[PDB]
């Protein structure tokens, strides 16, 4: 931090980068370990009214697999529309 | 309906030799079925609907240490599931195992009349609701 | 779907798989028993055992299906059903970003001709099935016990196989080698009876059979 | 047409020097191999519709660039692969015979979920 | 009638009607229930502006709490609950949402009871929620306002 000036320029030169701007050891930027009491929020449905489980009962909303064909003019169709070709990233087009 | 050199197998299927269970564990293991009786403290009924494959209980010696119930009965913890007894016995005979049967506990008709609970010449009058 | 608890349904593709399900059903009605889709936009078309070759050869090669990514070769034991072993395939379409899933029924002995031709990924999966569930597959290049121990007995995921197993191991001085004694557990697996005797979901309830 | 590309974007598959007329001749192949299939069969009525159409837009504009977005099959070089795959099927069910009805209904409640 | 706050011409098991609506209504079984109130036994009880309505239902729900037999559950602990949350209403220990909750609670005890006492418990308090809502709104707002 730590190190002295002439050492910094030595490793700055050998790496071709400014390591003093950002390093890989935390010195003072670390958040304080003890923190104020974290008052948490409440649920979106936390309300004393109109929140019966008759409305939100997702486990109940599920329907057994809808059967269409059973052992006991027309047009061809696809399982999904064909995918589209992604373009080059305009940020870095060529590495 | 499946004609590809089919062999007319007239003998009951015996897959016991493939599963490779120990010989002492295929003959000296009475295998039994029944549909569980409802837990009398729980009025719920959605458990007495399936037959199960459960076995006979062997010995349970206390551990010399703190006292866990050490057991050497691998087949004891083998509660299976069965939709019908016919499928239950089908599994039992397919790997031929010394087995016994049990009849599905069927409810009787509860003739209930709340108007009966109050009467003039009938003794089913209830003193307190 | 203003409520944030349940996940929203997606109907546009929901109708699309059903249309594709009928599209597959009409082409090869000799092998498709029944086809259906679930709430979570997952379609499944059900095939006959001897149908492992052409149905996947269809999905692997069709210009309008082209499902080539073999996902998984699973099996599901159902002791009630006569053909307890249920071999389950799973394919993914690269161009049409969908997941087909075909499953069959098979007894302990009855084989399935190896589907390594349509997907060589199944080859390495195929070894596991005979190791893990024990269902032998016909004309398989090399169908080996590859994931369980050497010289194991039986098939552990048959629901008749104890969780603890049949043989335990220890190093024995008098033979200076590991000997496989029968299991003798220090503690017994304390099974828990976890089944509420009240109706769980009126939707998926089995009617009186 | 234009300048022939050097890479298809996928290793193994190379740019075809003969894009359209090769695809056309193998397409005429998949018209004729489909011939020995009866008309009432569903795969015929699906295929010749999907066959006779994309034989159209290939001859609609011989250039490689526009035809990539005519069929949504990506680059033409993989359309050769996939059309060949469709050719493979027509040969495959020439012996499969997949049009007489379902072989046999499943054994009792062989699906039955839940149990 | 100007100094009047609310006459209840049905009695206990009948919704209180505000003074303005009392000026324009016929008292028959039909017309009164058109105004969403009951006529019952024609127990015409008069209560004017000086007395607070929350205190009126305070004694009313207290009467119902001491008359329930506890046979059917929705009336037994239900009529207990109305008294408890309303007890907060009188002093003002509630919030405007809690007014909706007690109306929602009053919906639950409606009909589900063996007899009509539980239903008869709803009618007076239910009429309050629809009619004297601002009076309840100022009642529990004042408690918190001058508490600080
Ligand atoms: C070879 C190069 C010449 C000898 C070493 C020179 C050296 O260490 O210089 C200090 C220092 C050490 O490296 P640094 O990364 O800059 O130190 C950062 C902190 O100051 C380091 O912070 P710090 O807390 O380590 O600072 C205190 C440190 C300071 O330590 C020193 O100054 C080293 C010399 C101690 C005597 O002393 C100690 O920690 C006490 C224990 C010493 C251990 C044994 C040292 C043996 C040295 C060689 C003995 C003969 C062989 O280097 C410089 O100041 C410039 C580079 C060396 C230039 C030499 C002349 C040209
Ligand atoms: S509603 Fe009627 S039956 Fe039920 S507890 Fe109240 S008085 Fe008794």
Side-chain half-sphere CA neighbours of A38 within 13 A: 3
Q: What spacing in Å lies between the alpha carbon of A4 and ligand 1's midpoint?
A: 10
Query: Degrees (nearest 5) of the Cα angle E26, E30, E33?
Result: 85
Cis peptide before A71 (omega within 30 of 0): no
Q: Is the dihedral of CA E105, E107, E109, E112 positive or negative?
A: negative
Pairing type for strands B31-34 and B99-100 reads parallel
User: Would you tell me how many other CB atoms lie within 10 Å of the CB of residue E116?
Assistant: 13
For an interface test with B, which of C135, C188, C195, C202 has the most B Cβ atoms less than 10 Å from its Cβ?
C188
Residues 6+ apart with CB under 8 A from A74: D45
CA distances from E55 to C63, E60, E61, E63 (A): 79, 9, 10, 13
d(CA E94, CA A48): 12
C and A touching (3 or more beta-carbon pairs closer than 8 Å): yes
**What residue owns the CA closest to ligand 2's atom 4?**
E72
3-state SS, residue E128: helix
Residues 6+ apart with CB under 8 A from C51: C31, C104
Phi-psi region of E88 (alpha: psi -120 to 50; beta: other; left: phi over 0): alpha
Q: What is the resolution of this structure in A?
A: 3.6
d(CA B54, CA C166): 17
d(CA C201, CA C199): 6
E22 labeled binding residue:
no
3-state SS, residue C131: helix
Phi, psi of B55 (to 5 degrees): -115, -175
Cβ of B2 and D103 within 8 Å?
A: yes
Experimental method: cryo-EM
Q: Which two tokens stand for residue E56?
A: 């009126």
d(CA C127, CA C106): 16
Q: Which two tokens stand for residue B80?
A: 């299976």
d(CA E108, CA E100): 12
Which DSSP string corresponds to B41-90?
T----TTTT-BEEEE-----EEPSSS--EE---GGGG----BSSHHHHHH
User: Would you tell me how many other CB atoms lie within 10 Å of the CB of residue B50?
Assistant: 17
3-state SS, residue B99: strand
- With CA atoms as reference, report the closest residue to C83 among D112, D13, B34: D112
Gap between the terminal Cα atoms of chain D: 60
Contact assessment for residue E124 and residue E60, using Cβ atoms and an 8 Å cutoff = yes
- With CA atoms as reference, report the closest residue to D51 among D70, D31, D32, D71: D31
The torsion defined by the Cα of C156, C158, C164 and C166, in degrees rounded to 10, comes to -70
Phi, psi of C177 (to 5 degrees): -165, 155
Cβ of D107 and C81 within 8 Å?
A: yes
- Interchain contact C158–B (C-beta under 8 A): yes
Identify which of B4, B70, B81 has the shortest CB distance to residue C187. B70
Q: Which residue of C has its CA nearest to A65?
A: C38
Tokens 């009313």: give the residue: E60
Contact assessment for residue D93 and residue D43, using Cβ atoms and an 8 Å cutoff = yes
Tokens 């729900």: give the residue: E61
User: Would you tell me how many other CB atoms lie within 10 Å of the CB of residue A14?
Assistant: 8
CA distances from D101 to A72, B87, D14, D93 (A): 12, 29, 42, 15
Contact assessment for residue A28 and residue C4, using Cβ atoms and an 8 Å cutoff = no
Q: Which two tokens stand for residue E132?
A: 């004297």
Closest ligand 1 atom, CA of A3?
18
Where chain A is broken, by preceding residue (C–N > 2.5 Å)?
A: 1, 72
User: Would you tell me how many other CB atoms lie within 10 Å of the CB of residue C120?
Assistant: 12
Phi, psi of B51 (to 5 degrees): -85, 150
Phi-psi region of B125 (alpha: psi -120 to 50; beta: other; left: phi over 0): beta
Contact assessment for residue E139 and residue E133, using Cβ atoms and an 8 Å cutoff = no
CA distances from E29 to D32, E25, E38, E110, E119 (A): 87, 11, 7, 20, 17
Q: Which two tokens stand for residue C103?
A: 């499953």
Contact assessment for residue B15 and residue B94, using Cβ atoms and an 8 Å cutoff = yes
Which DSSP string corresponds to D19-44?
HHHHHHHHHHHHHHGGGGS-TTSHHH
H or E stretch at B33: strand B31-34
Q: Which two tokens stand for residue C184?
A: 């003798």
3-state SS, residue D110: coil
Q: Is the CB of A7 under 6 A from ligand 1?
A: yes
Axis crossing angle, helix E73-91 with helix E96-108, rounded to the nearest 10: 160
Cβ of E104 and A47 within 8 Å?
A: no
3-state SS, residue B23: coil
Contact assessment for residue C71 and residue C91, using Cβ atoms and an 8 Å cutoff = yes
Phi, psi of B99 (to 5 degrees): -130, 160
d(CA C197, CA B48): 8
CB pairs below 8 Å between B and D: how many? 9
Q: Is the CB of A3 under 6 A from ligand 1?
A: yes
What's the longest Cα–Cα distance across chain E?
48
H or E stretch at E47: strand E45-48
d(CA C106, CA C112): 8
Query: Degrees (nearest 5) of the Cα angle E46, E51, E56?
Result: 70
Q: Beta strands of D1-115 (E only): which ranges?
A: none
A and B touching (3 or more beta-carbon pairs closer than 8 Å): no
- With CA atoms as reference, report the closest residue to D112 among C10, C14, C46: C46
Per residue, the 3-state secondary structure of A56-91, as one string, reads: CCHHHHCCCCEEEECCCCCCCCCCCCCCCCCCCCCC
Contact assessment for residue E135 and residue E54, using Cβ atoms and an 8 Å cutoff = yes
Axis crossing angle, helix D19-32 with helix D76-96, rounded to the nearest 10: 10
d(CA E83, CA E113): 17
């Amino acid at each position: 931090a730590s190190a002295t000036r002439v050492i910094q320029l030595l490793r700055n030169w050998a790496s071709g980068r400014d390591l003093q701007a950002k390093l890989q050891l935390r010195y003072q930027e670390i958040s304080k370990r003890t923190q104020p009491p974290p008052k948490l929020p409440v649920g979106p449905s936390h309300k004393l009214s109109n929140n019966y489980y008759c409305t939100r009962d997702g486990r109940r909303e599920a329907m057994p697999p809808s059967i269409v064909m059973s052992s006991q003019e027309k047009k061809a169709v696809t399982p999904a529309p064909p995918i589209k070709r992604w373009e080059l990233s305009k940020d870095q087009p060529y590495l | 309906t499946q004609d590809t050199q089919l062999i007319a197998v007239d003998e009951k299927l015996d897959i016991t030799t493939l599963t490779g269970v120990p010989e002492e564990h295929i003959k000296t293991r009475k295998v039994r079925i029944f549909v569980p009786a409802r837990n009398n403290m729980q009025s719920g009924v959605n458990n007495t609907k399936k037959w199960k494959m459960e076995f006979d209980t062997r010995e349970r010696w206390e551990n010399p240490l703190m006292g866990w119930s050490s057991t050497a009965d691998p087949l004891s913890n083998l509660v299976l599931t069965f939709s019908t007894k016919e499928d239950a016995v089908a599994f039992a005979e397919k790997n031929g195992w010394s087995f016994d049967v049990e009849e599905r506990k069927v409810p009787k008709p509860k003739s209930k009349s709340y108007g009966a609970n109050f009467s003039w010449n009938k003794r089913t009058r209830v003193s307190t609701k | 779907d203003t409520r944030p608890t349940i996940r929203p349904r997606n109907d546009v593709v929901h109708k699309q798989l059903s249309a594709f399900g009928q599209y597959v059903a009409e082409i090869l009605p000799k092998y498709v028993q029944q086809v259906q889709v679930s709430c979570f936009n997952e379609l499944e078309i059900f095939i006959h055992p001897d149908g492992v070759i052409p149905v996947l050869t269809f999905l692997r090669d069709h210009t309008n299906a082209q499902f080539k990514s073999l996902a998984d070769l699973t099996a599901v034991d159902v002791p009630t059903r006569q053909n307890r072993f249920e071999i389950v395939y799973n394919l993914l379409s690269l161009r049409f970003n969908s997941q087909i899933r075909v499953k069959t029924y098979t007894d302990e002995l009855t084989p399935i001709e190896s589907s390594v031709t349509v997907y060589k990924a199944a080859n390495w999966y195929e070894r596991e099935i005979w190791d893990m569930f024990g269902v032998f597959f016909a004309n398989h290049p090399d169908l080996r016990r590859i994931l369980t121990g050497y010289g194991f007995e039986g098939h552990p995921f048959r629901k008749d196989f104890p969780l603890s197993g049949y043989v335990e191991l220890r190093y024995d001085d008098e033979v200076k080698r590991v000997v496989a004694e029968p299991v003798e557990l220090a503690q017994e697996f304390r099974k828990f009876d976890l089944n509420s005797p009240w109706e769980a979901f009126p939707a998926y309830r089995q009617p009186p059979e | 047409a234009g300048l022939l590309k050097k890479t298809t974007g996928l290793v193994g598959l190379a740019v075809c020097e003969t894009p359209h007329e090769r695809l056309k001749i193998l397409y005429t192949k998949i018209l004729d191999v489909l011939g020995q299939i009866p008309k009432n069969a569903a795969y015929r009525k699906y295929t010749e519709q999907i066959t006779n159409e994309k034989l159209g837009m290939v001859k609609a504009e011989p250039d490689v660039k526009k035809l990539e977005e005519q069929l949504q099959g990506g680059q033409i070089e993989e359309v050769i692969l996939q059309a060949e795959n469709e050719l493979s099927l027509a040969r495959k069910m020439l012996r499969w015979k997949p049009w007489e009805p379902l072989v046999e209904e499943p054994p009792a409640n062989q699906w039955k979920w839940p149990i | 009638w100007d100094n009047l706050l609310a006459v209840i011409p049905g009695g206990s098991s009948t919704p209180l009607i505000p003074k303005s609506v009392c000026e324009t209504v016929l008292m028959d079984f039909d017309a009164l229930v058109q105004a969403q109130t009951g006529l019952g036994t024609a127990a015409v009880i008069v209560m004017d502006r000086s007395t607070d309505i929350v205190k009126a239902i305070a004694r009313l729900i207290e009467f119902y709490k001491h008359e329930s037999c506890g046979q059917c559950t929705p009336c037994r602990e239900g009529v207990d609950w109305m008294n408890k949350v309303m007890a907060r209403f009188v002093k003002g220990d509630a919030r405007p949402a809690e007014i909706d909750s007690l109306w929602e609670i009053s919906k639950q005890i409606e009909g589900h009871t063996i007899c009509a006492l539980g239903d008869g418990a709803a009618w007076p308090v239910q009429g309050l929620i629809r009619h004297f809502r601002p009076e309840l709104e100022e009642r529990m707002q004042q408690f918190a306002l001058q508490h600080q």
